[PDB]
């Protein structure tokens, strides 16, 4: 309807995206590299741990700016066969530029580790606020959902698939706006790809079924997210991943009684097993989503410009978790030099 339509506002999108692509490609082809050193950073505390090492709150000594430094033990990345994913992660993250994406501010490596210095978000991740509060109101969830729709419009126009959408991966900034943090499974691919990766609750059925897949898996994951934000639980849950997968591939979804009829219609079109019928994957692409009823109150340009009043602003002062802290040990011999040469 309004979705299968041009041209004046659709042309501005086109122009924005073409300029963004030109920007992106320069950085894609000539990646930033070795742009800091460990000793430039005062390590304040551990924020969290991933499979490859700690994420630390750090302070850049020469600007006093605060960042989150993701450390990756090279040997653990090799054992986990995540070399190419790690290289994707960094190559893509240094190249993108969007208001709702965590910036890769510096990267470097030493004998033992890879280091990714990221934009610090004082609010922490959405997961925590969502579990604490229980669930978000539809307008609240719509606000965040709108930011993901624009971010996906941006990433997809660059031939990127994100592959890890979930509340754990979305940071809330000082203005109450979102930043997508984790590029671990991001990939640049024209056409189809096959890696079984992602987080069980958020996997599209074509991933579970080893079908080979594209960017439409991101759109399904948006469906899970919106449902999770508004329900306070995932549309498919169980105690074990294999029980989750059977629920995902069955083709059935029950909605809570408080979901508006517009919300349910949106979600049915996002959580659609049939790629032929899944919103975001049709002739109108993202516009099927953008001009849906549930989004009728959304001013997209205002969202992009951060003009909309955030429903929640993080308290700034204690509140941090405590971890055992230990000094970074750097081996005297270089590990996995060849495998990571391009980092």
């Amino acid at each position: 309807a309004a979705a299968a339509k041009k041209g004046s506002e659709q042309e501005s999108v086109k122009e924005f995206l073409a300029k963004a692509k030109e920007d992106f490609l320069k950085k894609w082809e000539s990646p930033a590299q070795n742009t800091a050193h460990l000793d430039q950073f005062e390590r304040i505390r551990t924020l969290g741990t991933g499979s490859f090492g700690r994420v630390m709150l750090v302070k850049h000594k020469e600007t006093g700016n605060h960042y989150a430094m993701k450390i990756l033990d090279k040997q653990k990345v090799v054992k986990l066969k995540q070399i190419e994913h790690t290289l994707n992660e960094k190559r893509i993250q240094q190249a993108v530029n969007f208001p709702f994406l965590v910036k890769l501010e510096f990267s470097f490596k030493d004998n033992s580790n890879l280091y990714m210095v990221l934009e610090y978000a004082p609010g922490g991740e959405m997961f925590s606020h969502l579990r604490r509060i229980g669930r978000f109101s539809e307008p609240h969830a719509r606000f965040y959902a709108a930011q993901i729709v624009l971010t996906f419009e941006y990433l997809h126009s660059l031939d990127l698939i994100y592959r890890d959408l979930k509340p754990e991966n979305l940071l809330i900034d000082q203005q109450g706006y979102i930043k997508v943090a984790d590029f671990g499974f991001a990939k640049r691919v024209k056409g189809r790809t096959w890696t079984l990766c992602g987080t069980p609750e958020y996997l599209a059925p074509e991933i579970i079924l080893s079908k080979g897949y594209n960017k439409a898996v991101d759109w399904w994951a948006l469906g899970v997210l919106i449902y999770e934000m508004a329900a306070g639980y995932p549309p498919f849950f169980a105690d074990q991943p294999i029980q989750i997968y059977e629920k995902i591939v069955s083709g059935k979804v029950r909605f809570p009684s408080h979901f508006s009829s517009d919300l349910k219609d949106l979600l049915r079109n996002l959580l659609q097993v049939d790629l032929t019928k899944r919103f975001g994957n049709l002739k109108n692409g993202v516009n099927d989503i953008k001009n849906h009823k549930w989004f009728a109150t959304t001013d997209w340009i205002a969202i992009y410009q951060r003009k909309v009043e955030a429903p929640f602003i993080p308290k700034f002062k204690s509140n941090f978790d405590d971890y055992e802290e230990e000094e970074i040990r750097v081996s005297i011999n270089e590990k996995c030099g060849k495998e990571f040469s391009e980092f």
Binding site: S51, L80, K81, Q82, H85, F127, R131, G134, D164, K166, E168, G184, F185, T195, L196, C197, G198, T199, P200, E201, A231, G232, Y233, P234, F237, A238, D239, P241, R254, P256
Partner: peptide
């Protein structure tokens, strides 16, 4: 309630990605 079933399940904390 479905919420009570969720809160009682073993998947209410941070969920790890798989890559096999």
């Amino acid at each position: 309630t479905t919420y009570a079933d969720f809160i009682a399940s073993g998947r209410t904390g941070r969920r790890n990605a798989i890559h096999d």
